[model samples]
Target chain A: MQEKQLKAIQNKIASWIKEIESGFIDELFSKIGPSKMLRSKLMLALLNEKTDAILLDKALNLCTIVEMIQTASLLHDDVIGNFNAVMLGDVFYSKAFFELSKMGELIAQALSNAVLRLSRGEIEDVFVGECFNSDKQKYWRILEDKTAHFIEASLKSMAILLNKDAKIYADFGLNFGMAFQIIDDLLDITQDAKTLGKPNFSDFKEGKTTLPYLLLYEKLNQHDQGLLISYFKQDSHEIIEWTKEKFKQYGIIEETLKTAQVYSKKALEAIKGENNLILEKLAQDVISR
Target chain B: MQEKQLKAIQNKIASWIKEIESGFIDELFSKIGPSKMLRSKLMLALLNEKTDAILLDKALNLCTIVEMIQTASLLHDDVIDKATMRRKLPSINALFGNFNAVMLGDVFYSKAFFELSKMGELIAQALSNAVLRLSRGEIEDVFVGECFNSDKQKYWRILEDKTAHFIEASLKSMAILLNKDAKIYADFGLNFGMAFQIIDDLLDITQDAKTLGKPNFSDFKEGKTTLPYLLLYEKLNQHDQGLLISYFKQDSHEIIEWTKEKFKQYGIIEETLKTAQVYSKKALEAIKGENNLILEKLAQDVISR
Candidate 1:
């Protein structure tokens, strides 16, 4: 049932893309990385099961807006590495905002506020966490700021539309995003390039020391922590082998993976009485993935 | 009087930045390139002189928002263009990393929209659409790349998107704030930007590096096919056209002299000036019915510069 709604949303997105009416835009859209539609899925799952035409229309538009916002952030994030992606990110962001503007001032304010948090989080990730910083609190803040806020805003907007209590779903979305990013970072470390479909330890190589590294630092003694800090931004055989051996010896990877499961559990438990099976399943899927 | 208004706008922007309360952001903002504040000036100039406190506050907020948008674009643009210098200072990307520059630009853009959303839906929609178009323009600019014979239609389309649309939005937002006819001011802004960009483009060839605060012939050196170059190319003989095309990416003294000589021979400078002046004339004519003396001076100053 959710699959059909998801497909409808995709078609709506296609129609929106068609409205752009440019061959170059069409071609560029084709070349983009495949989307998981996590934000859209979360939004659709939150909408009432007995959705009417008005509610469905709003859902479709919000789904499209969320997807565009996610894609734009991805594109802009890629600019940390494509001038092309950068431009595309800007295009997506502006278009998303343009659509959201028509929706209402409240929705516009909510989403734009998320965007601000997301942008600030990017700066923090780059400047604050660019090197190995062992402040676990700051790391968690960055996670929520950069990733959780958008998802939270997504669910919260739907709640606002439904005139239900938004706080619960906002909590659900926040914990879900936290778990999602933790799992992502864990996968980046544990999965090989072939399995991950991207280069392994890319986060570390790009100077982003994620949760695994943070957890590992806490387990290590002063000397070992110094050694880990030395290898923070390094990509070499010695550093890689040492990291592998240290991670195995301390079993920090398992702990790091367990932390994500905790977050996933918290996400699931947030809306226990809401009885949204799809959302509960989504939270479970977040960790397993 | 405009100077006082402009200073007030700056103070409002400072307050907005202060609200963010990020130490790094404050430091990063300080390192940004100096602003000409053209958008802010245009917005303030279009407002009623005997404005109410509410109108005055809206004008101030709008000016700050537009300036933020323009500055954000500059930061991101420098990263993509890999420009080292802007407004006679080291670019943010050049000083810091491209990563920081991109992040800061995102900050400015989101902050601008957030503030604009609080203003109202119409103003928010106008600026957001303009931003979308401007981004599309940026994509087209990169996609078109170094094609010397890139179509005139594409060129004009890009010019409108890249420069004119945001200016148009600035005017339209100001008009909407003052409850004036938006279309008239939007027309004025469109033509003003068109003329403004053309004049700036020609000045790249006409002025010295020191005078322009960046290298002379920088656009051609970077493979940009601006209006003067297009006009000169169109008037060139087949052989000479190929010769100019060969020198597209070459920044040698010989190529520079050759292109300059060709521009002179074909009267490309005069031709480009004529085109820009016509836009300027149209811009002035758009507001002829109104008592907008400041905007008139702005258009005149653009052409004269």
Candidate 2:
């Protein structure tokens, strides 16, 4: 998309999001709200850009629904993290689903079903007591379930909107999302709070066992194993520092980055005829950016 | 419906509710559930006495969805009240977790809405509008809590919006499904639901935990002034009125005793039951001389329960 055209899309989306934020969407709010992968945007842009007059209005609302669906999941996410969200994520999710209902049943069900997947992913993410223990591959798939599925739904929703073949776009978004989340896990441990605009090694703080942590957790000695178990229970500097050291020593960071690259390659390959240059760039960034 | 047939309907519905109780539906639980299916049965009975198999299946599912929508509301209600037991079993919020309970509530609504879409847009729109009204009512309830101030009339308005409206939708949607007079049937549902909730308010103070399944005094404990307490608040002495005013949740056993005694002394329970009869009368008028015996009997039975 061109700069002027992209700015126009942003303007239209921002105004609607603001209208959604400010009031009872039974009335409307302002400012704006969220999505996974940005694949929603790329997919929507593809659907609309091909038509004369650009299908701008439908794209506008559909894209907003796409953003708010992810926003609502993260609101639920904030609760699991013990952060307070002031009914704002709900502000997006509730009215967005109501709006989707106006379009059609399939549209509504698609979003609801996607949220169900998102919820299962979140539930397992926090409460995966034993599943993440024995099956590392299943654990990887759970990551895909939690994150990739929502992006896939966004692509699928666009495809449904246009009544086109959804599989190609859905596949592209799913692969892109899996790589995106893997890249996110890498950054969480390796990047600083200032750099990522989030706390470094914060997953340790939350006792969340992400890809890198799981890889490193396997490498821990029996003595440190006891300490790692108590990471969130009775958190200590030694545990975080010890975990951080292993990320370096065991090349778990390299392993995680490699895993991310594997998916990133798959994402780029999922793109076929008439792909957006910007979306391609975003997908490629998952490898090393 | 015949006695054996009604029992069979009850059995079928009962087992399904039980099967739903047993699972990771984050779900599946037992009867030991509230909805007597008077409402469910009433709507279906209105549709036809000797129904076709196709109509029977649709009505069965529709009526069941109505109950689950209310069940979903109850799930959220338990969360708000922080209640531990429901239907004399561990409430979903208490057993599974509040977070799960919240998600389950959404799942129920979504699932119900999906089913409604298949039924018809008219039915779906009525139920959807009712839910939005209900969500607003709930938001208002939270906004008003801890303030400890409520008016008698306002309490009924809130009750109608929060509790009664959905039950009304339950019947009204069925009326729509059957292609009956939508206006008259909606009015019937409105009255039945209002009386139903009033009787429920009466039982909150009047019944014991063993009988009620839920503990008595939960409404008072939550500082929600229902009709029994509202009547007492109106009739009691001015200085004594301050007693109700100063009370917070479970501040003492004394207030609970005193409030119950006041209801008995001032005939508030009887008055509350009588008020429900007025709505029941309206429900009877709603019947429009149609021989809806089950619906008629259920509304009559509300005040006594």
Candidate 3:
């Protein structure tokens, strides 16, 4: 039953983008893709807060918003990264507020501030993407800023609609988002491009200090650890080979996967209701990946 | 008097940008340069509608959002064109690369809407609608690159979408703030924007880089079939239009010089000025009763320039 609702919300988000009738927006929506995880976040928070037609409608609307914000951020990142899309980025950003305005002024006003926080997260992501560092707090902070806030927005907007504890949903998003990113970071090293649908070792080669690398950087012997840190920005084939070998020898990948589980558990624990149990499963799947 | 108001708004925008702590937004703001003359549109709308401390504060806030949206649009275009510089500063797309440049607009768009939401939904919707048209205009810009339909009306409609709509919002923002007689004031800004763009198109060809403080014929260099070129290209016979296409291919100063000669020979430049005059006339007419102090000067100034 929970699975059915999550899919319905996800389907609402997907159909809303199509309803906009713009070639540029359609291409952008397809390229960045619609977000299912965020839709689940919206649904679970609203369900946990209370269950009703009005709240579900709000959840569905908020789902569409978070999805649009997600697509806009990717569209912006892709433009800067020299991928395909621009006027489309503008369309999504504009469409975000266009929907917000129709949702009513108060919701529009709240979301206006939320999107600002979202952009800040993205800027921090770009800044972190270019910098080579392993500060645990800083890395976690970036994941929240870049990846977590939209999830938080989805829940918080539902919380506002549900008149429930806001942080009750907010913490769930932060933990879920952090776990989601950590799993992605782990997969970037463990999975190949053909398998993962994106390039492997991109995090390492591009100088990102993901969880697995940082764990290995800590556990590896001093001399081996120095080699990993030394090659941080080198982007060479050998750096990856050396890094992967250290990840294997130091049992770093296994530890990183374990770390994702801890947060996924925290995500599951954050929930209050049983009807929304599927969100726990969703978190489990994230860590499993 | 207008200079005083302009400086107040400019100072507010500068200080506001400084308050945002991120270095990312700072450089992007610098890339698009600062707003100029947009306040002229706002001033006209406010004077005719209402002008008081409360109204001025709202008008100033709206002006800041307007400026941010305009730069945000340019930031998007910089990626589209792979542009190097805007307003004599290196564009974000070129300086920090496209990723930083493109995401730069995202920050602005969010902030712009955030500020607008505080004002009122009507203003927020106005700006959103304007940006939608602006993006649609951008799509048309891409289409024009592939197929330059010889239809003159098509060129003007595209121009309205790409450029004029924002100016329309600039006035409408103020009118909505007054919450009285909004569209009437927006009427003036629309004509002003149409006339404003015609001047930009003319000066792009008529002046040099040194005088204009930027490269001349930039629109031509970018292959934009703006009014001057569209008209100049239209006047040409089959062979001459072919000559025009061949020159468009080279994109060199020599070709620009050659095109200017044709514009002058066929009086296309003067005719473009006449086209601008029509808008200025409408702009002046829009403010008939208010005896609007600044708008009259602006309409006259746009025509003379």
Candidate 4:
């Protein structure tokens, strides 16, 4: 049943892009490999097992909107990295908003506000990534702004669709999303390019100091802390070797994983009465990996 | 009265940004110079003489939305164009970085749509559809290439998608708001925008940097072959066409001098202006029954500019 719903989402997304009447856009989108569809997975999981056809269709549309919103951010991220990427993002973004508006006022407003914070977080990342800082508070704030908020928006939309409690599901999504991103940040450091299928230590190299680095920075002596700062935004072999040894020596990876687990624990706690096994499993999958 | 309304639109834009609760956004936006406000002016021009305050407030909101949409596009274009200067000052991307400009542009677009959603879904659909096409056109403009393109049909199609459609959307949206004939207003805006962009292309070549508020020959230097360049290539001999194509992808003052000399010799400037005039005249014809003297003058003003 979940497989069928996810397939419907893929079908709906395809139909939506085809309506744009541009072969270039259609082909470009088609070439993008399948995503984890985490938001859609959560959206569908939050629905009752016996939803009607009309309600299911609206749920599918909301799922598609969130996925497209995610795709737009990735494309726009690429553009920050040019000419083609920006438009591709813009087309997806406006088209997503166009469909969301048709869905009605509340969802439209929710997602647009999410996009606003998402964009603000993107700008903050660009500025903050300029140099190293030890402000864990700002880091979590940006993490909430850029990642967790949109996922929260997704569940908020589902809450509206199912006529359920918006606040409860929204809390679940926020906690789950924070765990999801922290785990991603951890995986970037611990996993190699072979396992990750992309460059490892990319966040650090790109000057993004995530949870482990922050914790390590806090635990380090003044001399070692200064050394860590100097190695930041650098890809030198000595810096890489020294950082690897330091991370292991301080057990920063374990500490970061524990931080992610706390969020996952809170996410499960948020839905204490709902008894959603699928949502519980999804949250576990995020922190466990 | 128009000046007062324009000021109201500015105030609305400022208030909207303030709602974002970011002093950085406010400061960044405050530094931007006042624009030509062409789209706002068009939206205001479409209103009736005895418009009530309630109707007028909605109109101001629409105008604000259009202007924000325009500013968003300009911000994204500056990143794409690698523009160093805008309005005689360093561009946002130039001062801060491309990332800042791109993100800021996204904020404007999302906020604009947020406001547009309140107006009605139909109007939101119309404006977003145009934006989709506009973004596609921006991508097309980048890939349109360094070689001299002689396909006038292709050039006009891009112009229509890139600029004319959004302008048409502005008028069509206004018509929808005013409960008027959307088709007639759309036609007028389509032609008006076609003329407007063509004249802008011409000015890039003919005007000085001081007049342009940015560098001249930027389109050619950036490998964009506009209408004038297209027309000039058509009139050039095969040898000279090759010579012109060679100069692309590299910056040279000599090519500008040569292109200017050839433009004079082949009378391409007058020919390009004639094309814009044709569109302007068609724009005037669309609104002949609407009694909008400002729009008629606007169409002519684009040609003269």
Best by TM-score: 1
Which docking class does model 2 fall in? acceptable
lDDT of 2 by residue, B166-274 (tens): 7788778887777777777788889988898888778777874346364367777777767787788888898878878777455557777887788888888779888
Q: Is candidate 2 or candidate 4 better by DockQ?
A: 4
In candidate 4 the C-alpha lDDT for residue A94 amounts to 78
In candidate 3, which residue pairs get closer than 3 Å at backbone N, Cα or C atoms, i.e. clash?
Answer: A80-B98, A80-B99, A81-B99, B204-B217
Best candidate, DockQ: 1
Q: Write the per-residue lDDT of candidate 3 for residues A214-258, one digit (tens) a residue.
A: 788778788887777788767777777777787789888779888
* Predicted structure 2: lDDT: 0.66
Better of 1 and 3 by TM-score: 1
TM-score of the second chain for every model: 0.95, 0.86, 0.89, 0.95
Summing lDDT over every window of 10 consecutive residues in candidate 3 chain B, give the lowest-scoring window.
B41-50
Q: Over all chains combined, what TM-score does candidate 4 have? A: 0.93
As a whole number from 0 to 100, the lDDT of residue B150 in candidate 3 is 66
**Per-residue lDDT tens digits of candidate 4, residues B173-257?**
9999988899999999999999999998999889643453633677888878889889999889999998888877668888889
**Interface RMSD of candidate 1?**
1.2
Q: Report lDDT per candidate.
A: 0.83, 0.66, 0.72, 0.85
lDDT per residue for candidate 2 within A181-287, as digits (tens), equals 88887887675334536436666566466788778778878876666666643356676677778779888988988888887777677775646676677777656
- CA shift at B186, candidate 1, in angstroms? 1.1
Better of 2 and 4 by TM-score: 4
Model 1 lDDT on a 0 to 1 scale? 0.83
lDDT of 1 by residue, A29-123 (tens): 77875667878888888777687998789878988898888888888887672687777678778888888888877788889889988988888
Please tell me the TM-score of chain A for candidate 3. Answer: 0.80
